[PDB]
Amino acid sequence: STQREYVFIPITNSITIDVKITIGGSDHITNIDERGIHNVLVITGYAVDEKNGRLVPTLDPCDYVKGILVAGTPQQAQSNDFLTLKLPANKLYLIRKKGNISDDLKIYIPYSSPDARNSMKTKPVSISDDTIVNNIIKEVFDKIYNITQKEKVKIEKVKEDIKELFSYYALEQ
Amino acid sequence: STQREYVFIPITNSITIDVKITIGGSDHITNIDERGIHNVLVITGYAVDEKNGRLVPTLDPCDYVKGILVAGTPQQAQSNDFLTLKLPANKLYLIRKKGNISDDLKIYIPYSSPDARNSMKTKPVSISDDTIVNNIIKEVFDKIYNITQKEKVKIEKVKEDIKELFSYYALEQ
Amino acid sequence: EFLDYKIIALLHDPPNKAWVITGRARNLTQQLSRKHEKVAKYIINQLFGKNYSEKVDNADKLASSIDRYLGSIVYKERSLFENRSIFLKNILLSNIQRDIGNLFPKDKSKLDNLILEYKKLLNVINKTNLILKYQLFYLIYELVWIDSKYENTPSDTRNPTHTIFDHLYATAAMMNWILSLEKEAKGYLLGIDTIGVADFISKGRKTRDLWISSYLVSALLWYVITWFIEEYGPDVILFPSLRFNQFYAFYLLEKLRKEGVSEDVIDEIKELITKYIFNGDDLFENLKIPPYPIIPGRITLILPGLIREGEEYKKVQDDNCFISKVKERYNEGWRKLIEGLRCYSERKREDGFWNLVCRVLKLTEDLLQTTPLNIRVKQVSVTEDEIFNNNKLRSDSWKIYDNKYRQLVSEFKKSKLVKVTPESRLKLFELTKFDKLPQIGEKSKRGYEFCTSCGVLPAVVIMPKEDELEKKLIDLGIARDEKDVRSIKNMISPGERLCPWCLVKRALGAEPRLMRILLLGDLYSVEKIVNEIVSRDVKIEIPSTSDIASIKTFEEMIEKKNEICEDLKEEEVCEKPSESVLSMWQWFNKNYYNGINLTIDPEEYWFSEKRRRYYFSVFRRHRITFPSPYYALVRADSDYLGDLLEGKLTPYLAGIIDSGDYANISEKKEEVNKLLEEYLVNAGSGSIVDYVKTVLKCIRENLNKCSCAEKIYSNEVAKVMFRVNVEKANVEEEVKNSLEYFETILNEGRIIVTPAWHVSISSALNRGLLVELELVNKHKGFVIYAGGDDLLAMLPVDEVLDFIKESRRAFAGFGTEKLGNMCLENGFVRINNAYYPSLPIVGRSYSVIIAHYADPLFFVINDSYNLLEEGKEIIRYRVMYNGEYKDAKKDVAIFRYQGLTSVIPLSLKRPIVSSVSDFNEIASIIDVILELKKRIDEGRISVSLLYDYEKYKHLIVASDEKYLTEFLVKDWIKRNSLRKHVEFTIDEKLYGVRLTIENYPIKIPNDLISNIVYTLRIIYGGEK
């Protein structure tokens, strides 16, 4: 099996890629075959600050976040703010399951120190402002999952695909 | 800014102290005055690790780690062993809540590293076996007052909320 | 008449009552403007608003017994008997609860967050098509509520033994009575039953025959009840509950696919269905049919007395308008399946095996007219007289539904006295006396050559033996040429005779998508259904008993691939998957992709004769163990479930009281009351319990006779002043009616059955079905049918013991790690913070036949229904009941291996669960066999352990001092142990069980430890 790295969804140009190398292997997690971005995960209580973002947490179920999993390098090989976590993959709050999933993992979620001595101030709002939709695929798809997304039968709805799904949570701080 | 603590309630013989001297006051949450244990706290998405009596997060919003928020001092030593967060009291998963408390808090939650040297699994478990309730409630929580077990006319009632409310998820490793 | 007033009932009480009632947030009722009806009215913004008349009031009363239990006027009062703690109590047990503190829409900011989801799902249905608005909302009501992660709340904080979602569906089902009685009154409780299911399943050579014949039972019944789904929408089906069917949801999607709908709303609703109705298995989307034949078997409707054909509903013409309608709606499905099979077979007129099916579907038209399944329908009725005084409910009306369902059950058991096999309807006298029987193939040297699957009917397609097939296929009419032979042989074995009915089973076994004709029903024309089947190349391969007997071999050469690979290179073992075929078997699908080609017929391989020694040598060099020819046919069935639907107490005290005892409940008055008094007091906790605690006090030995008010008036009258709103509460009558209620309960010795009691048991029975399917997939098994309480699977002999262990406990709600998207929490299945009750008390017996893969599947299935269903009926063991030692008889898990029989009780405690600590010892003898079996194959204990027990047995039997027996088994273990550090204990509550059996051709050792030894010999006998 391959070790993975869940890439999240920002709002600004800063926290889109945050990783320097690509697949390495060949077997992956997320698929967008023709109609929908399949196999996307959700994690409860984890903001990513959408600027200076390293997965700051939240302490309730109502908070969550969603983004696709890629089996890429652990974010330019830093040994500071990871989790060194893995589990039989029967414990993933994934959306749009498709097919038998591998029953292992090795994920290093870049979850840093929480935002100390500040209240939640967390904002539930989905992704909007299509200029932000084009902002993300500008740098996260045309080379990471670019086997598709350039000449597929339907690419312009993959932008539509993130319209429905992603509704992150940020601390507004 | 109540310097809070979270002593959780598993069957383990590892929750002996893990903490030290009192809140800084007496505005507690052991609201056992009326009918037994009141105002429970349940973390969502954490393990209990069945050993090394701290908590480990696992990223599915399916887990319950329960225990009473009795404040105090984190052994007077730790800073990184806890999330160091600031809750406004309205962003938790609570049980048996009384009149709303609209203040804000300090957060020290017993944390074990994710450290998936092994694989992470979730093991359902609860409390039974009279000696298994005889051990822990006498270890710590009976000493919150020690006026309990002194004149407490609800001994038959408080003894059950260990096997009624606090159901945690072990590690199976 | 346009009634459609059930949506007013399905939302009359929002899934936020317990937080809105005796308020927690109390501001989402502020931030829009009776208290809980306001938040109930606000969410009704799509269409017609709530009617404060005969649309909820009377329906909500007869829906559940929470108007009798906790009083009629204090139910509708939300006042004085308050309790500001939302517990959720199980319905079968009451000593088990969850706690439901706060996960719910608290503000309109969060409240409308889901109303936009409700609307964005029904915004796609044209507003003229209200029947799709109801059908869709019916299934997705609680689904979109579970996705938006909200805790499930009880229908009443006082008596928390009813989930609000179930009580909502309950009052909507009773709504068909209330409505049709407000009009010209008539209301029916229709019920359908299938005569001889097991005998229909047991007719098949292969498992694809077993699987198809087990799928016809579900399809033919689904094609009937889908007509009621189309006429009166859902909620007219009490059993099986629709709110979790895999058959309904599948039919529901193809309705949206029909008539056009938003492609990302039919999809928006398809991740809901895949996540919850199924468990993350979109295999049905690729299969195009629901993978598992869920057999309801016993369907009970609650119909209104209103019929269509007036272009809209009218008064029903005659009472027989419903029985005749089903009987003809049932034979239509058989015709419409013979139609599609005829059409499809001519579409593929070439390709072989279909030019044969064409030749018989035409030669035997008259025979195939008759359905081979022969259901039986019954019906009762109600009138305005039995339910109303003038226009309001009458006293004692609350028991009408219970009594009406009583007559329905009796009428079934009354008719089950005469068993009419479906073969009797055929006309075969002149077809066998004179040689007019069409015999495509060989000519019977001796008459007509009975079928090899049935055995009863004569055969139409006789097959030559393996002298040689080609020169005997092509000359005879069977084969037109030679190329079709290898295509006929692929579906019919040489020597196999087939009757018209069984060939239809084989034909549908070659193309299971043809079942869509019955699955959807009156949605697509038969030709449109067939077209999509010939417009594709789906290849659905179904396992056989030789495939199941090769799991550990396949799974061994699948991880020694490269090594086992070079030597053959040509034997299709290292062939590469050349197609993308699929299967309902979630083990074939699960691998299929390790260059191993799981499609190879093992009977041309290690299970062959020209190739046996070869693959013995092949397996020899690679340390691969030669496979055993034995599989395990596991058949589960719950105990006294239908007897539980009558509200009886036999499922609780199985064996201590039997179904026969209810002919005179006074003979068991001491026990039936000890339980019923316990169920009532524990249910309905809060300030109310001490009130009812005193009402059951003043009964016991023919007590006060209404002179108990004195003790309980003080309870109520000193409580009614807690709020100044008492309208006309005649407390001297209120406490009387409550005393009248519990009286009938204790006199009848059974819970008074209401719709909510049924809908809850029914829905839980469908959720337990979900977790039961993950377990049969987890243990590499093959589900043959699993509908509700029943189950039929084919496991390997290896995973059979631990399957029973997990399946038995998962049925009781207790369990370890989640299976799909649902966990098992001590008698409460939980789907994303939503707690649902299970059936912890209901016993569940098992029947394991360890059979050779070559044994005739007719007599293996027959034994499984005549090893248990008449062997489980006679087995008694010594159960621990309230300190005494009584004799229970149920929940036994029988094992059988060609003569050897074993019985392993799963409870040993007669009220199987009375506290949350009762779960961890259900099936506690199984892991005793599992641990023992584990220590043997590791050489830590010799297998001679099973052979020496005979001499230790007489001492362990005669010894009644447990400190002495815990040394005799410690000695018997260590003597024939192969090491010096094996410390294997026996739970010590297993010393003395004494399983007996009344004069039967089944010899069971009369002690438990001996049965543990026989169970191992049976498990080990089926591995060599």
Ligand SMILES: [Zn+2]
């Ligand atoms: Zn036949």
